[PDB]
Enzyme design. Structure first.
Site, PDB file in Angstrom:
ATOM      1  N   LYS A 194      43.619  44.610  38.449  1.00  0.00           N
ATOM      2  CA  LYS A 194      44.131  43.661  38.399  1.00  0.00           C
ATOM      3  C   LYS A 194      42.941  43.033  37.711  1.00  0.00           C
ATOM      4  CE  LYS A 194      46.562  39.319  39.475  1.00  0.00           C
ATOM      5  NZ  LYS A 194      47.510  38.306  40.586  1.00  0.00           N
ATOM      6  N   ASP A 199      45.035  30.391  33.934  1.00  0.00           N
ATOM      7  CA  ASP A 199      45.904  30.190  33.610  1.00  0.00           C
ATOM      8  C   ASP A 199      47.413  30.163  34.202  1.00  0.00           C
ATOM      9  OD1 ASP A 199      44.006  32.159  33.183  1.00  0.00           O
ATOM     10  OD2 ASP A 199      44.815  33.968  33.165  1.00  0.00           O
ATOM     11  N   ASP A 234      52.410  31.853  36.933  1.00  0.00           N
ATOM     12  CA  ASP A 234      50.977  32.259  36.163  1.00  0.00           C
ATOM     13  C   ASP A 234      51.347  33.475  34.610  1.00  0.00           C
ATOM     14  OD1 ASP A 234      50.593  30.099  38.623  1.00  0.00           O
ATOM     15  OD2 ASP A 234      50.128  32.503  39.598  1.00  0.00           O
TER      16      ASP A 234
END
Lengths: 192, 1011, 288
Positions: free
Chosen positions: B775, B932, B706
């Site tokens: 995040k 992603d 990722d």
DNA sequence: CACCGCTGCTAACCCCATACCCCGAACCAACCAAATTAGACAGGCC
DNA sequence: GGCCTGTCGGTTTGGTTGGTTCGGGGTATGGGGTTAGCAGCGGTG
């Protein structure tokens, strides 16, 4: 006890007023002419009448329409608390009845081939005229009694012609129903 | 008696005369309705009806204007297909009578009628020379006119009679895409090693037959996972009653359907339009079965009337397309074409030359059957309202439930006023709900389009051909602006979209299989007692003042339902191999089509799936499985790869114990960040280490890599920002660079200033700024500014922090987003420059009344659909549901400006993922993409990383900002008036931020770029 | 906003309210406040605009008695689904606790009196909010049958006081408030009507309680969604019971129209439906 | 197996209708209005 | 230009506007069409 009969009706329009006043004169001058022709010539008279003359009838109609406005308003105001409900009931019933009558006249106007005639119908058609009796009911009872007294041999011709009319009715029903299919009315065909 | 008989005969003849007398006596919504009516009548072969309505409209002064050349062409094509030369001539007479000019479609219909009727060469020749004198083109007919294969065949038969050596243009040589980035993808120069499936040709044909059958049925019956047992008497009685009621509803629905079709038929006999032919488009039995299915699947809480109408319209259109292909021979041609296509994928079959699935598919044919345009929205809405109202009126049931003389409707529509505007809601009878609950039906039904495919999907050959074999599937999900984006997808050169189509086809070709053990455990918890701690919903028995209890109960029931469907489909697909076709959004991001069961789901969903085809671990397979395991645990996020591997070696005993006794052992896996995925990786690692040769173990578990804050990676690449490249692990490093920690620190200093100032939110957020919070927050501001889909998720992550006063969770989330924005713009000034440049440019472009359009580096055109103020409403006797037509009046400047940067970034990450997928496919790697994340086999993790970095450097190496600037300048700075706004717009577009010093090549050496 | 600036009107109002503790809403310049104080009233002023507080307090310092000035927007008290985070917004429990006001049983007499003027552009909003609070037995009505005297526009006054006798203005707020309080016109200022709303002691019954009023609101909004339709038509979408049977229970014919139903007719309808005995369920209410 | 209504017929008596024009009522496609309520930036108006 | 204000498958229902068709209004005596009475039966549910 009919509210509709006492309800104020619309005033006659200009042309309809002119015809309503001219018709008696045309009838006096042409007592034997058919109403068709008289109404036609009256309509031609109206078409030929100068607009300035029609204007008078139009104005009269307009005043009659004002007085009709006042009258209809007052009548609507006069009815009991459920005045709108009673007006809806009478108007609805009037519309449904009108449509129903129109449909009945339509169904009556159509031309479906007559059903098959029975041997009894044939016998009545052949013997009614000579059957004694003071009235159609009494002559029909006479024909009924003589029919009940008929033997099996005396009825052979009537039964034969009855069968022949059964075949005839069959064929005519085939062709006619087919033509109705052409007109897109398959609902009138025999169910099974 | 001849007197009476002759009288009857005479009256009959007079009646015949009477019968002779009786025989003697700029697009618009209504225009769309009429045209759709005619086009629809061509499919049902009810030409006399459409011709009747057309004649009636033509004969009326005010109606003739409503007719269009396309309608006359429709009826004319119908008669030509029927060979009614006289009626076709009559239609031509109407066309000339109403002025206007006949067209290529008209002359093509004439030629079709003459060929089918085999007219004389004198009339055919005369028609061709009148066509020549009119200036029309012979070759433009076969190319510009949309005709069926039968029309083409008949026209060719007519032409070959006069010009036997008349030949259509030589076809079909396909052109190759010459894009800068796709050149090496399509160029023959290079050694290709395209992978093959593990299934043999005959197996793939059997699966293809199963999928074809499933789509033909349009329904899928899956067995319910759990709670089959129930009281013997109750379920029995409820099931008997439900069956009887379903028979009654079936009959009543058939009768009501026939009566309605009759009503509409008579309405067509009158001068009014009606949906009669649309109801005559599909078999009445199929209509009844569809309505009964919708009734069986209707949610207990109800469904929006409009939404239900839309669903019914969609299933009607779908089943109609399926029927048309079924009866038009497209099915057999698809069987042959696909049966030839399977040679490229099958293991025991070879092809002449290597090529991509799309290339081979187009090479075999490629007729691609026929494309059917959907119905206008007003027709879909009116049809939906018709079907729904008919269902409600027809479905009756007794109120006694558990001597039922009284009858009440099964469905009753009530109204919700929460929205200031009353909305129509369809609600089922509570007694019906209790009946279905007591019955405990052990079977669930799904649409063929909502479950995975049992065979490799169809390669994407165009924006209208893809996904399930028969059912039509849109190339782009985005419904808003579907007309604009679709029309531009068809406008762009066909080669421009080659990359995207090949990427989606590759994603769809990935073979999947179910993890038996994971399913067994997840069900074991679900079958008995849920485990909310492990993301397993609990049954209503575990539901817990009254208002809160009811709220929690409703939420638990929702989650229980979703898990029921997902796990049910998983159980149905237990012993089968399946493929998930992918779709795109307006941004280009790919998403699986089957929503219930797919790899984009939660942790449990991701753990239930694994690669159907295996890959020997090799020399680094085991190490990559252990490193991946540590990544899933989240215990060594900051540690380097070597220390993650060492940690795996340390907790190896807990890995084996967790794998052997998941629910009876030490249950170490339950403590991981991703418990189910961690457990699966523990089973895989156990199978690998316990094998005779770990390097030869055929591993099926996918491994994930990722990109941390991929958006910030793209911004750092665009501006060559060194601070950004280091923060987001673009610059190589032996330890992972956590941008969330630095941003958390800066935001901590800002929070120290504001908290020093006395602010309440800043004071309450003290000690709560953490990696996860920041995040998800940064993941928000980057990919999302406004439209709080994810912002609500952040509110959730804060709500899960017990020691936080939930009163400020909302204001605390807003404040956190603002502070993340400010901080990122402070530490990344260049990034702020690029963002402000793009945002301002979009503001100015939208201010001129034009939506922002661009082209990805892969040739994909992207357009923003945000518009407003389009509405029109029908009225069925009597709710008046509104509808949003596709005609837009003005753009929404705010959404455009706020959305342009994020959407562009989405196009960049999507382009990167696509390049990586294609180039990895050249090397024979299995590639799938979740947001992603890039997944691959443990044996090819290194190679996949190589392709990833190479394609990233190649992507950002081009002047993306420059090319975008020149593009927007050419496309939006051309208006001759006014020139001032074009001068300021050009002034802002040519202000491209200067790039930094960072050397993009360093990405090739960054170990933790994607990990 | 609206402010009382005429001294004469302030005196007339003062004599009217004097005709207990008085809560004055948005005194503004303080003309009515000074009139009440001179008339001998004990006043608690809830001022939404802090700029008016000084002078008001000055008046208090002139009397230096039991007058009390609070920076509070009465129309923002106890926000529905709110986090309680505003100075002007407050809690009636805390405010009344500070003012020493204790709750009394619903059957008890009027414990307090509130007076003021509805917002010039928030009359409907205020009426809906107060309706929710009253029928829910929350806010001020948690302390008893609070008497509420408020100036209102002529349109909203006529609509509020409308009934089947004037069907064009009959609406949900008319039914709710005519059933909830005995409204009386105390003064008309050109046009603004000072309406007195006193909750009825007999509003709540065995079947109409603060626990099921939500279902009744749902019924009212539902019926008024299509005001021209028949009552039975709406009932068929509101209850599984025999709609004709219910309407007959309330003594109405099948052709009875919605606009012909009196507020007490609606109330007897709802209570009649709740009273139904031989049915597994009575209502179809399922909305967020 | 049951129930309808159409033929066979008459009877005198009961019951609707083509020629025409005038304008009030009334049925479509479309736009708009209402109901409802609890801190920054961009658009609209003067 | 500066200042003030609104905002972050708008919902269904129904009210007015521009158009266009539909029918109720007036009628006369002449023609049709009509319940009653009794039996038989093709067609329908």
């Amino acid at each position: 006890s009919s509210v509709l009969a006492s309800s104020p009706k619309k005033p006659v329009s200009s042309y309809l007023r002119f015809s309503k006043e001219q018709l008696p004169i045309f009838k006096a001058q042409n007592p034997d002419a058919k109403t068709t022709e008289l109404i036609r010539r009256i309509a031609q008279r109206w078409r030929e009448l100068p607009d300035s003359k029609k204007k008078i009838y139009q104005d009269a109609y307009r005043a009659e329409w004002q007085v009709y406005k006042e009258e209809i308003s007052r009548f609507k105001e006069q009815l009991t608390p459920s005045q709108i409900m009673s007006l809806e009931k009478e108007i609805m019933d009037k519309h449904l009845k009108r449509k129903a009558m129109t449909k009945k006249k339509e169904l009556t106007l159509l031309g479906k081939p007559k059903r098959p005639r029975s041997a009894y119908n044939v016998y009545v058609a052949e013997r009614f005229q000579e059957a004694k009796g003071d009235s159609p009911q009494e002559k029909l009872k006479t024909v009924k009694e003589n029919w009940k007294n008929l033997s099996d041999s005396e009825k052979e011709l009537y039964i034969q012609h009855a069968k022949e009319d059964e075949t005839r009715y069959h064929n005519e029903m085939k062709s006619w129903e087919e033509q109705m299919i052409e007109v897109g009315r398959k609902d009138l065909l025999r169910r099974t | 008696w001849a007197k009476i008989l002759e009288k009857d005969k005479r009256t009959q003849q007079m009646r015949m005369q009477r019968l002779k007398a009786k025989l003697q006596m700029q697009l618009s919504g209504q225009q769309q309705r009429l045209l759709a009516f005619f086009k629809c009548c061509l499919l049902t072969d009810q030409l006399p009806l459409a011709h009747h309505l057309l004649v009636v409209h033509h004969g009326q002064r005010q109606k003739r204007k409503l007719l269009t050349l396309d309608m006359y062409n429709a009826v004319m094509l119908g008669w030509a297909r029927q060979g009614a030369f006289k009626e076709l001539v009559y239609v031509l007479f109407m066309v000339k009578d109403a002025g206007l000019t006949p067209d290529l479609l008209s002359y093509a219909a004439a030629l079709q009628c003459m060929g089918r009727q085999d007219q004389d060469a004198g009339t055919i020749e005369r028609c061709l020379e009148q066509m020549s004198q009119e200036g029309l083109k012979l070759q433009a007919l076969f190319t510009a006119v949309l005709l069926s294969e039968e029309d083409r065949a008949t026209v060719l038969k007519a032409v070959h009679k006069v010009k036997p050596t008349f030949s259509l243009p030589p076809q079909l040589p396909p052109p190759v895409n010459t894009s800068k980035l796709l050149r090496d993808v399509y160029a023959k120069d290079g050694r290709v090693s395209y992978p093959k499936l593990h299934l043999p040709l005959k197996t793939l044909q059997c699966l293809f037959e199963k999928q074809l059958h499933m789509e033909l049925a349009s329904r899928v019956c899956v067995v319910s996972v759990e709670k089959p047992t129930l009281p013997s008497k109750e379920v029995k009685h409820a099931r008997k009653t439900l069956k009887t009621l379903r028979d009654q509803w079936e009959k009543a629905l058939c009768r009501a359907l026939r009566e309605t079709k009759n009503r509409l038929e008579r309405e067509v006999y009158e001068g009014r339009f009606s949906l009669y032919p649309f109801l005559c488009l599909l078999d009445e039995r199929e209509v009844v079965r569809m309505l009964l299915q919708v009734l069986q699947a209707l949610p207990a809480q109800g469904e929006s009337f409009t939404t239900l109408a839309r669903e019914l319209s969609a299933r009607t259109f779908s089943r109609h397309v399926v029927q048309r292909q079924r009866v038009s021979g497209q099915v057999q041609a698809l069987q042959n074409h696909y049966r030839k296509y399977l040679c490229l994928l099958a293991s025991d079959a070879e092809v002449p030359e290597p090529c991509l699935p799309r290339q081979y598919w187009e090479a075999l044919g490629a007729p691609e059957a026929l494309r059917e345009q959907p119905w206008p929205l007003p027709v879909q809405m009116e049809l939906g309202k018709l079907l729904a109202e008919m269902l409600v009126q027809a479905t009756q049931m007794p109120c006694s439930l558990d001597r039922s003389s009284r009858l009440v409707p099964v469905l009753y529509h009530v109204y919700s006023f929460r929205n200031v505007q009353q909305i129509g809601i369809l609600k089922p009878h509570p007694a019906y709900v209790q009946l279905l609950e007591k019955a405990a039906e052990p079977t669930l039904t799904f649409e063929a389009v909502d479950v995975p495919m049992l065979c490799p999907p169809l390669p994407w050959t165009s924006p209208h051909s893809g996904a399930f074999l028969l059912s039509p599937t849109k190339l782009m999900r985005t419904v808003e602006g579907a007309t604009q984006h679709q029309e531009l997808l068809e406008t762009c050169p066909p080669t421009a979209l080659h990359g995207a189509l090949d990427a989606l086809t590759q994603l769809g070709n990935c073979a999947w299989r179910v993890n038996g053990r994971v399913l067994d455990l997840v069900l074991q918890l679900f079958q008995a007692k849920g485990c909310p701690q492990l993301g397993v919903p609990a049954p209503p028995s575990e539901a817990p003042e009254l208002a809160h209890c009811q709220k929690v109960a409703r939420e638990m029931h929702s989650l229980r339902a979703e898990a029921l469907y997902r796990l049910s489909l998983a159980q149905h697909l237990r012993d089968r191999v399946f493929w998930l076709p992918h779709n795109m959004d307006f941004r280009g991001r790919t998403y699986p089509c089957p929503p219930h069961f797919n790899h984009l789901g939660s942790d449990v969903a991701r753990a239930l799936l694994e690669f159907a085809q295996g890959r020997p671990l090799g020399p680094h397979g085991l190490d990559w499985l252990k490193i991946h395991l540590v990544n899933l645990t989240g215990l060594k996020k900051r540690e380097p790869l070597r220390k993650r591997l060492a940690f795996a070696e340390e907790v190896m005993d807990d890995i084996l114990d967790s794998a052997d006794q998941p629910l009876t052992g030490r249950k170490w896996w339950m403590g991981a960040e991703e418990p189910w995925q961690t457990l699966a990786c523990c089973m895989e690692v156990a199978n690998a280490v316990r094998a005779s040769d770990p390097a030869a173990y055929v591993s099926h578990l996918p491994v994930h890599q990722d990109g941390s804050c991929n958006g910030l990676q793209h911004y750092a690449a665009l501006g060559r920002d060194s601070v950004g490249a280091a923060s987001v692990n673009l610059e190589p490093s032996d330890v992972p660079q956590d941008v969330y920690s630095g941003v958390a620190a800066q935001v901590e200093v800002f929070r120290r200033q504001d908290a020093q100032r006395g602010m309440r939110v800043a004071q309450v957020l003290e000690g709560f700024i953490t990696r996860k919070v920041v995040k998800q927050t940064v993941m928000t501001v980057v990919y999302g500014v406004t439209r709080y889909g994810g912002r609500l998720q952040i509110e959730k992550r804060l709500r899960e922090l017990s020691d936080f006063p939930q009163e400020f969770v909302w204001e605390a989330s807003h404040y956190l987003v603002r502070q993340v924005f400010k901080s990122l713009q402070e530490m990344f000034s260049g990034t702020r420059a690029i963002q402000h440049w793009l945002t301002e440019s979009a503001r100015l472009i939208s201010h001129m009344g034009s939506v922002v359009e661009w082209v990805t580096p892969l040739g994909v055109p992207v357009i923003q659909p945000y518009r407003l103020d389009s509405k029109v409403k029908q009225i069925g006797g009597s709710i008046t549901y509104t509808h949003n037509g596709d005609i837009s009046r003005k753009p929404n400047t705010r959404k455009q400006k706020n959305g342009f940067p994020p959407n562009f970034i989405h196009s960049l990450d999507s382009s990167h993922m696509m390049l990586t997928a294609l180039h990895c496919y050249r090397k024979g790697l299995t590639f799938v993409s979740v947001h992603d994340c890039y997944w691959t086999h443990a044996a090819d993790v290194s190679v996949m990383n190589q392709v990833c970095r190479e394609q990233f450097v190649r992507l950002h190496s081009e002047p993306i900002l420059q090319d975008l600037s020149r593009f927007l300048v050419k496309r939006f700075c051309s208006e001759p008036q006014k020139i001032l706004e074009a001068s300021q717009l050009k002034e802002t577009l040519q202000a491209v931020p200067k790039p930094g010093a960072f050397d993009l090549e360093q990405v090739k050496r960054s170990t933790y770029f994607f990990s | 906003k609206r402010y009382v600036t005429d001294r004469r009107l302030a005196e007339t109002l003062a004599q009217i309210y004097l005709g207990h503790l008085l809560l004055e809403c948005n005194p503004g310049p303080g003309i009515l406040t000074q009139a009440l104080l001179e008339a001998g009233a004990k006043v608690v002023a809830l001022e939404s605009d802090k700029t008016f507080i000084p002078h008001l307090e000055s008046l208090g310092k002139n009397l230096d008695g039991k007058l009390r000035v609070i920076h509070c927007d009465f129309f923002k008290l106890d926000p529905r689904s709110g986090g309680v985070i505003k100075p002007p917004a407050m809690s009636s429990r805390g405010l009344f606790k500070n003012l020493g006001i204790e709750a009394v049983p619903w059957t008890a007499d009027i414990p307090l009196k509130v007076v003021g003027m509805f917002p010039s552009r928030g009359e409907k909003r205020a009426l809906w909010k107060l309706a929710y609070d009253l029928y829910s037995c929350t806010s001020i009505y948690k302390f008893g049958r609070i008497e509420v005297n408020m100036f209102i526009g002529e349109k909203e006054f006529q609509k509020l006081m409308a009934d089947p006798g004037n069907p064009d203005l009959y609406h949900v707020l008319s039914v709710i408030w005519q059933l909830a309080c005995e409204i009386k016109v105390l003064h008309m200022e050109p046009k603004l009507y000072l309406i007195q709303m006193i909750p009825r002691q007999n509003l709540f019954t065995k079947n109409l309680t603060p626990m099921n009023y939500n279902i009744f609101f749902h019924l009212l909004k539902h019926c008024f969604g299509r005001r021209s339709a028949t009552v039975i038509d709406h009932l068929r979408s509101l209850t599984p019971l025999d709609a004709r049977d219910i309407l007959m229970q309330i003594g109405k014919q099948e052709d009875e129209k919605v606009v012909n139903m009196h507020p007490q007719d609606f109330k007897t309808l709802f209570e009649t439906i709740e009273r139904s005995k031989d049915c597994a369920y009575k209502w179809l209410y399922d909305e967020t």
